Design a protein around this motif. Structure first.
Motif, PDB file in Angstrom:
ATOM      1  N   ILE A 143      38.028  45.985  44.399  1.00 36.58           N
ATOM      2  CA  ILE A 143      39.339  45.568  43.944  1.00 36.58           C
ATOM      3  C   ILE A 143      39.959  46.680  43.109  1.00 36.58           C
ATOM      4  O   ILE A 143      39.290  47.279  42.275  1.00 36.58           O
ATOM      5  N   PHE A 189      45.743  43.388  38.889  1.00 37.61           N
ATOM      6  CA  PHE A 189      45.079  43.829  40.118  1.00 37.61           C
ATOM      7  C   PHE A 189      46.029  43.868  41.292  1.00 37.61           C
ATOM      8  O   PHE A 189      47.019  43.162  41.295  1.00 37.61           O
ATOM      9  N   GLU A 190      45.682  44.688  42.291  1.00 37.73           N
ATOM     10  CA  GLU A 190      46.301  44.647  43.623  1.00 37.73           C
ATOM     11  C   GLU A 190      46.290  43.224  44.148  1.00 37.73           C
ATOM     12  O   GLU A 190      45.373  42.452  43.846  1.00 37.73           O
ATOM     13  N   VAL A 204      48.008  40.297  40.990  1.00 43.34           N
ATOM     14  CA  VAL A 204      47.167  39.258  40.413  1.00 43.34           C
ATOM     15  C   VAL A 204      46.866  39.659  38.972  1.00 43.34           C
ATOM     16  O   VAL A 204      46.453  40.789  38.708  1.00 43.34           O
ATOM     17  N   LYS A 222      44.786  38.723  35.467  1.00 43.66           N
ATOM     18  CA  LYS A 222      43.644  38.053  34.886  1.00 43.66           C
ATOM     19  C   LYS A 222      43.789  38.126  33.377  1.00 43.66           C
ATOM     20  O   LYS A 222      43.651  39.203  32.801  1.00 43.66           O
ATOM     21  N   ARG A 243      40.535  29.406  40.163  1.00 43.62           N
ATOM     22  CA  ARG A 243      39.356  30.250  40.083  1.00 43.62           C
ATOM     23  C   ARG A 243      38.312  29.616  39.174  1.00 43.62           C
ATOM     24  O   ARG A 243      37.522  30.314  38.548  1.00 43.62           O
ATOM     25  N   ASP A 302      35.749  40.590  40.193  1.00 43.77           N
ATOM     26  CA  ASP A 302      35.160  40.121  38.929  1.00 43.77           C
ATOM     27  C   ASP A 302      34.001  40.994  38.451  1.00 43.77           C
ATOM     28  O   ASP A 302      32.818  40.655  38.603  1.00 43.77           O
ATOM     29  N   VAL A 352      43.207  33.277  36.037  1.00 42.60           N
ATOM     30  CA  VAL A 352      43.776  34.218  37.003  1.00 42.60           C
ATOM     31  C   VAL A 352      45.120  33.679  37.491  1.00 42.60           C
ATOM     32  O   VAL A 352      45.295  32.476  37.644  1.00 42.60           O
ATOM     33  N   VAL A 405      45.642  40.183  46.538  1.00 45.61           N
ATOM     34  CA  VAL A 405      44.791  39.697  47.611  1.00 45.61           C
ATOM     35  C   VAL A 405      45.197  38.255  47.879  1.00 45.61           C
ATOM     36  O   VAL A 405      45.749  37.591  46.997  1.00 45.61           O
ATOM     37  N   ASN A 449      44.362  34.433  47.970  1.00 46.89           N
ATOM     38  CA  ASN A 449      43.416  33.690  47.135  1.00 46.89           C
ATOM     39  C   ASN A 449      42.408  32.869  47.961  1.00 46.89           C
ATOM     40  O   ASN A 449      42.258  31.664  47.742  1.00 46.89           O
TER      41      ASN A 449
HETATM   42 BR1  LIG Z   1      41.884  36.871  42.652  1.00 47.64          BR
HETATM   43  C1  LIG Z   1      40.937  37.962  41.437  1.00 47.64           C
HETATM   44  C2  LIG Z   1      40.033  37.393  40.527  1.00 47.64           C
HETATM   45  C3  LIG Z   1      39.343  38.192  39.654  1.00 47.64           C
HETATM   46  N1  LIG Z   1      38.440  37.916  38.718  1.00 47.64           N
HETATM   47  N2  LIG Z   1      38.078  39.051  38.146  1.00 47.64           N
HETATM   48  N3  LIG Z   1      38.731  40.047  38.707  1.00 47.64           N
HETATM   49  C4  LIG Z   1      39.521  39.546  39.650  1.00 47.64           C
HETATM   50  C5  LIG Z   1      40.398  40.133  40.514  1.00 47.64           C
HETATM   51  C6  LIG Z   1      41.116  39.351  41.415  1.00 47.64           C
HETATM   52 BR2  LIG Z   1      42.314  40.179  42.583  1.00 47.64          BR
END
Ligand SMILES: Brc1cc2nn[nH]c2cc1Br
Length: 333
Positions: free
Chosen positions: A94, A112-113, A65, A67, A46, A174, A52, A115, A117
């Motif tokens: 998100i 986070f849930e 995920v 961060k 990222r 983000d 991340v 996803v 990449n």
């Molecule tokens: Br992959 C991801 C990168 C992020 N940067 N900031 N929040 C985020 C959430 C996810 Br899911």
């Protein structure tokens, strides 16, 4: 006399009508969890500073995920947490699953849930006409939602849109630069990445609003339809406005400066020059003509305006002809 005040055309007072707790993020008390509930699998590419991680929730074996928040004002952390919590369950936003600290280092981290990449930048120079309209429409749902909830994202760019192309699934990510809109608040202009910075940021007009995100959306759209990355390719923040001036022209720029009584950094006086407003046909060629239509150009033109108040709102954008078939197909399916 200083600059002339500005107010948002839509969702102007929504935070005022909320409880203080909704937006007074500094008073929010975070119940920090334990990061040993998660084992990190691998670092997700990222960027450089970024930390991340793909990880696994030990308790239930779900992929997540994580961060790791690089040391920054606790203010800024509470802000991102509160915005994420407030927008949880919104269309294409998100989902924040947990908030934790590593027991040893005490470093804050957001969970986070899962996803894939695969950000939009990897896919957005290879899309069909239809798919651009479809994903633009999906980003617009996230923006209208967050704007309706009193929040501006302030860092909309292809890197911050996670797309699962196989499931036609999109998440705006983000929210570390997002902020609450309050009528009359003067905001920091050192936000967004160079190429997606709105003119208001560049000329240092602070009383900006949700419409900022619509400028960034326009930059993405221009880039996609014209297959030109970035569309406004400045060497720095001063030159960035010159690149905008070379397309949008200098006349509307100076009319915008005069309308809001903006004191233009004297450094700009030699570099902006004099430029006509260019017709979009200038950027069309054989490689991109299949992505470009009258509807795309009319839509794009109404996003990319100096005067932030004259840009389409997200809801207005969603009602544009450019999305008629997307809307039609969404109703049936
Ligand atoms: Br992959 C991801 C990168 C992020 N940067 N900031 N929040 C985020 C959430 C996810 Br899911």
């Amino acid at each position: 006399s200083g600059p002339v005040p500005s107010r948002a055309r839509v969702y102007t007072d929504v935070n005022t009508h909320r409880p203080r707790e909704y937006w007074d993020y500094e008073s929010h008390v975070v119940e920090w969890g334990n990061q040993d509930d998660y084992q990190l699998v691998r670092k997700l590419g990222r960027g450089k500073y970024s930390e991340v991680f793909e990880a696994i929730n030990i308790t239930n074996n779900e992929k997540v995920v994580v961060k790791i928040l690089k040391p920054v004002k606790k203010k800024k952390i509470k802000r991102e947490i509160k915005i994420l919590e407030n927008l949880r369950g919104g269309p294409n936003i998100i989902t924040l699953a947990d908030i934790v600290k590593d027991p040893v280092s005490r470093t804050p981290a957001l969970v986070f849930e899962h996803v894939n990449n695969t950000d939009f930048k990897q896919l957005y120079q290879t899309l069909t006409d239809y798919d651009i309209r479809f994903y633009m429409y999906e980003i617009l749902k996230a923006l209208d939602y967050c704007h309706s909830m009193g929040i501006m994202h302030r860092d909309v760019k292809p890197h911050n849109v996670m797309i699962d192309h196989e499931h036609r699934k999109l998440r705006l990510i983000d929210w570390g630069l997002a902020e609450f809109y309050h009528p009359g608040q003067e905001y920091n202009v050192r936000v967004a990445s160079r190429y997606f910075k709105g003119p208001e940021l560049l000329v240092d007009y602070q009383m900006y609003d949700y419409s900022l995100d619509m400028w960034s959306l326009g930059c993405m759209l221009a880039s996609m339809i014209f297959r030109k990355e970035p569309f406004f390719h400045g060497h720095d923040n001063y030159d960035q406005l010159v690149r905008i001036a070379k397309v949008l022209g200098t006349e509307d720029l100076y009319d915008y400066i005069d309308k809001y009584n903006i004191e233009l950094d004297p450094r700009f006086n030699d570099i902006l020059g004099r430029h006509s407003r260019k017709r979009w046909e200038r950027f069309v060629h054989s490689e991109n003509q299949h992505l470009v239509s009258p509807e795309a150009l009319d839509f794009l033109d109404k996003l990319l305006r100096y005067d932030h108040q004259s840009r389409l709102t997200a809801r207005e954008a969603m009602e544009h002809p450019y999305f008629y078939t997307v809307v039609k197909d969404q109703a049936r399916m």
